[PDB]
A = this chain, B = another copy of it.
Amino acid sequence: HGSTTFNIQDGPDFQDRVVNSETPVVVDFHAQWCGPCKILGPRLEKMVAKQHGKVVMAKVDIDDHTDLAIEYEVSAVPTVLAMKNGDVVDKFVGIKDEDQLEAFLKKLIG
């Protein structure tokens, strides 16, 4: 699909848009009961969008995607994984501000 930011809909959708992505990906594990996700989520989303295809953001609602949180050993939300060619290359938990997200994205993109 056209957008660099998207909700993961299922396991195949994850395999295709994350594992098989040809660009680096930020996977944002969140949930509707997690207050801090409501700050982080839109923040990162906007900054990912500004990169115009150099990075993509897969949003994963943990409640709809329990398997995925198990596979990635997510124990709290928000968790954001940086992924490349199918593997995890960086991670953080909790909120980060704009400068920190910018640094996180530059480290991933180059």
Contacts and interface: CB of A to CB of B under 8 A. Distances in A.
Interface of A: 31-36, 62-63, 66, 69-70, 73-76
Contacts of A76: 76
A91 to B, nearest CB: 15
A94 to B, nearest CB: 11
Contacts of A36: 75
* Number of copies of this kind of chain in the complex: 2
A66 B66 contact: no
B70 A33 contact: yes
Nearest to A31: B66
Contacts of A62: 31, 33, 63
A28 to B, nearest CB: 15
